[PDB]
Symmetry: C6
Subunit: 154 residues, 6 copies
């Protein structure tokens, strides 16, 4: 039960948070003193940090048999999470205020370990799913603006 960082952990217990609007979100992310919680999370796919290949081959080089490339312009991907549709909840009202405002906010993912994943982004997709025998779900996707504060930066 005591959270081991060196040991693998199950995903059960992951929580989401959104910054309430103070300064310096990346400083002290392990305190929830100013983070609203998005309860009732069904599933969550974090962003995929990709990178564009940059071509590094000249005409003058001698070894033209194998492709030579280098990393360039890394980009944080999209984070997609599905919640239970609760319109009266303050979190979801703040979420669509975020959508209709267009600003980039800082959202945190708190894992069962003593580690957090802080990203800054703007929401780019909001949808719903209505089924007779299932709870109404709200699917949200956020596009990041770069420079994430990964958990292993501590």
């Amino acid at each position: 039960m005591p959270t081991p960082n060196p040991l693998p952990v199950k995903g059960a217990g992951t929580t989401l948070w959104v910054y309430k609007g103070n300064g310096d979100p990346y400083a002290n992310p392990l305190s929830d003193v100013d983070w609203s919680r998005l309860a009732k999370v069904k599933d969550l796919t974090p962003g995929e940090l990709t990178a564009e290949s940059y071509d590094d081959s000249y005409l003058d080089d001698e070894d033209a048999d194998w492709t030579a490339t280098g990393q360039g312009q890394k980009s944080a991907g999209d984070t997609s999470f599905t919640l239970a549709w609760m319109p009266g909840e303050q979190g979801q009202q703040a979420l669509l205020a975020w959508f209709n405002e267009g600003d980039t906010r800082a959202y945190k993912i708190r894992f069962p370990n003593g580690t957090v994943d802080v990203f800054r982004g703007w929401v780019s997709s909001i949808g719903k799913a209505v089924t007779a025998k299932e709870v109404i779900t709200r699917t949200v996707k956020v596009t990041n603006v770069g420079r994430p504060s990964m958990a292993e930066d501590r």
Copy 2:
């Protein structure tokens, strides 16, 4: 049974309505005094509110390692619902009058909660499905013209 907004709800009981043609559809959407009902709904997929990424990178900036973007020109998606084919019903006759007229009308989705979802759009697709052992179904898709009155605007 009393409709809790803060609590998650099942999708069973969702209904559809179309504005009969008075003024100000977004004002007082919780009264059905001027909304015709589209009965016998098989399934319903509401619109997906998406947004186009806007590039915000200049040559003069110093941090060119991570992509920086911002929300731009948000768009409401398509709403697709399937009904049971009832040509004599006034609702479906009004629906194909809507299709053959081309105007943009206001349609409402009433959830089992005390909340409504009002959109304005024009129908862009109408089809049928004929099967020996199943009821004839009419599939309809509506493209929205923007500025939806989401349920959490209250």
Copy 3:
């Protein structure tokens, strides 16, 4: 058994017809006095009435946050039906005469209700399927030329 238009119906009993070549197919479609029948129908997918979105955004407008569009140039889709391969039947001989002539003819779909669906189009695809244990099937697809006489125009 008496055909209720206001009530939903099962698809069993749908029939197909082709105009024998008199005038005004859209007038009095509920009489089969001049319509040949295409018997032995396996399955039938009617046309999908779609529409192209027309852009309505100017530079001068103030609200450039949400996409504004309008319906434009509606088009009837393709109708695809599969019959049992009967080369000696007059209907299928007339069907390939239709294919090899290129003219646009009026075909009717008669539902179990007291309603009909009349379209005008030209056949654009004719194929076969040969299997050891199944009857030989002839698949036909017709592209419409517009202005269908839907059932709810009565």
Copy 4:
């Protein structure tokens, strides 16, 4: 058992033939006096007779609400059949002679009815499938050059 053209038939018994090289293949196709047989047919998909839509809308016309098109440049599709790999058979040797020569030959499909399907085309694909527990199969595809002699031209 006596072959009824007006009645539907099962696909079992379909055979393939290739013209040995006399004149006028379309004349008298119901005699096998000069047609070699391709025995051991696993499956066979005949050609799909498609047609390209030709645009018929002018600026001067009044009805610009519905798309108006017309048939144009009909094309016979590809016929794909799989045989059992028998290199010593005269039929398959003639088939790869056909492939390596490039000429367009006339091949006939004889259905269990008293009807035949004669096409003229050139083979465009020849492959194999090697599996431990299955017979080696040779898959062949032929592209047609147009004007097929369908069975219902009699």
Copy 5:
């Protein structure tokens, strides 16, 4: 058991070989006096001999209703086989020598019949698959340079 060419055969027993580097690979392919063997073959998909359609329609022709084409620039496809990963085997060392040299070599497929399939090509893909409970597999794909010596040329 005696290999019948006119009769269909099962695929079990197919073997692969690579030319050791003498002259005239297409002459006498039924002798393994100078062919190294690639043992432990899991599966093998031979090349697909395709052909590009060449347009033969002029403006002057009278029959412009059906597409007329002709075979042009036939091409042998890719041959893809998977072996068991045996780095110490001389065959696989020769195979990656082939890959890192770039030359086009002649490889033979020996079927359970008394027939062989000789192709000339260069390897264009080499990969691996590591699974806990399965043997490590090496997948290889070879692109041919044309003019195969099919088995029925005898």
Copy 6:
């Protein structure tokens, strides 16, 4: 149990390593004196060594019936491995240091045999998967810069 190179082996026991930063990674790859280990590997797909086809057909040649090509500009593919998410592990911290630095490092795959696979590349993708009943997984993909030291170069 004694590792046979000539004999096929199961994939169980494959390990991953990253160079700690000395010189000449390709020299003596069978010693782990300066290689950090990436423990808890779920699955691993090594790179696929592909090659681009180079056209070798001139107008002057006589044989224009079959495509003639030759190997050109071979490229090592992407290597994708999934680990158990252990942020406190030195290996994963070094891995995201690698990602945020952009340099190309040498990573080794040690098979159950006495053979190693050394590649040089830069990481281009890092993602996560959060599930309630499964361990949190970190998926990593590395793009190679060419000239791999395959196991059969010994």
